[PDB]
Amino acid sequence: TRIKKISIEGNIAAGKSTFVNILKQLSEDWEVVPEPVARWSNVELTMEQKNGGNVLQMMYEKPERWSFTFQTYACLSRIRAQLASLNGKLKDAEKPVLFFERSVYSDRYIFASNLYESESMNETEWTIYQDWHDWMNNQFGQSLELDGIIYLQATPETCLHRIYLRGRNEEQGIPLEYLEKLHYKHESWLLHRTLKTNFDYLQEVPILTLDVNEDFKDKYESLVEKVKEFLSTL
Amino acid sequence: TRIKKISIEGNIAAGKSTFVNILKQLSEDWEVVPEPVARWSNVQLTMEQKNGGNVLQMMYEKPERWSFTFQTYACLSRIRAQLASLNGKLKDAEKPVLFFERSVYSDRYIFASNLYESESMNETEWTIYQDWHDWMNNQFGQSLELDGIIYLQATPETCLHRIYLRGRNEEQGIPLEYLEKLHYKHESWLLHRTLKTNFDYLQEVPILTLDVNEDFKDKYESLVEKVKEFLSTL
Ligand SMILES: O=c1ccn([C@@H]2O[C@H](COP(=O)(O)OP(=O)(O)O)[C@@H](O)[C@H]2O)c(=O)[nH]1
């Protein structure tokens, strides 16, 4: 691939969707793959979305019965959406960048891992999942390997506040203590670089850490400048 | 691929494992991919096999909770086991044939389908499975497309008797009425060719139907002769 693939990572409600749609518009060479599960959320037919909608709501109702199915599908959907763009976009662009909202790595090492640590996945489901994940990506990930990661870093308070603001019903019960596990997970993974994964190149992937505690919706030029400077080093 | 891939299909206990190991031995050009789930069954600690054992026994205990997970993993395991042999075997062989015990088609159109009709998979799981199956094989099946099928045909009585003889504990409760659903499924798929699938080339795939009602363990030369004659037409 001659297209640069950057994932944007970070806590629930940190600002990823907002930042990713900001980026989209700043360049014709810049293109986005929104997170498939994002699509599913809202209240136009599509089979993935019918499935996604259903499993997402079953997830809220009973995670210990639907984590493995949700996370398997959430992942496949990601891989195919990212392939679709990798292969169908930015062909005439001279500096092509593809921004992935989140990645197959946060699928496994943040979200699936959490679910297993909450015992919503038992040892068999967790082992089956990582194996399938291992294999799925061993074959298909090859054109998906990330050139860089941007980390939108927000305190859990910030995140909680933003879940409020987003006002998406199903989300309003998410406690601070949950956002803090994820935050510790992200910190470990992208800041201290302690989280050892099964994808070796990850240990050498450049990370950009961006503080998004302060609202950036109308004031984002310095975040974009840091992105651009970052991109020119990859 | 210059290797010929033939799947051996048929009801539980019809004789596939037996016939497949018979074939293995008759030629250096002839090579087998045993069904992964077959592996899992016994005991007397590879990660697939720990997973496979666990989910297989959870399947016996509660199919309506584990059918999706079992059938997802049984299938991935098959795809990767067949890829492994497709790419690592029969390189120096002049007439190379790979015999697959069962296939990704019986995974879906016999076993998964059955489970869905038993209501062990709900509409979402069934829809997510076929889609994942569609997609998994749309990408990876390309070197797996079968050149031919052999159908080992046995009455359900025969099969039941053989489940008896195999003496595998977990299997001893399988009723005749279950083996007859599968048999009707196999008949519909490989005899009347009415079972319409999502893989178009399947409608033109040559099938060899072999009566294995009579024991063939010590008397198989005419079955092998039919196989060889079959193979020369592919
Ligand atoms: O600079 C920002 C970025 C985020 N948001 C708000 O935070 C909420 C959720 O943001 P987003 O969908 O981007 O979060 P994520 O996609 O990371 O989960 C929405 O109300 C956004 O408008 C905001 O007010 N200012």
Ligand SMILES: O=c1ccn([C@@H]2O[C@H](COP(=O)(O)OP(=O)(O)O)[C@@H](O)[C@H]2O)c(=O)[nH]1
């Ligand atoms: O011609 C035959 C075919 C089957 N068997 C026995 O019947 C049992 C079930 O057959 P198999 O395991 O091969 O069935 P499959 O599931 O592989 O179709 C095994 O113990 C076989 O040795 C036999 O004695 N003679």
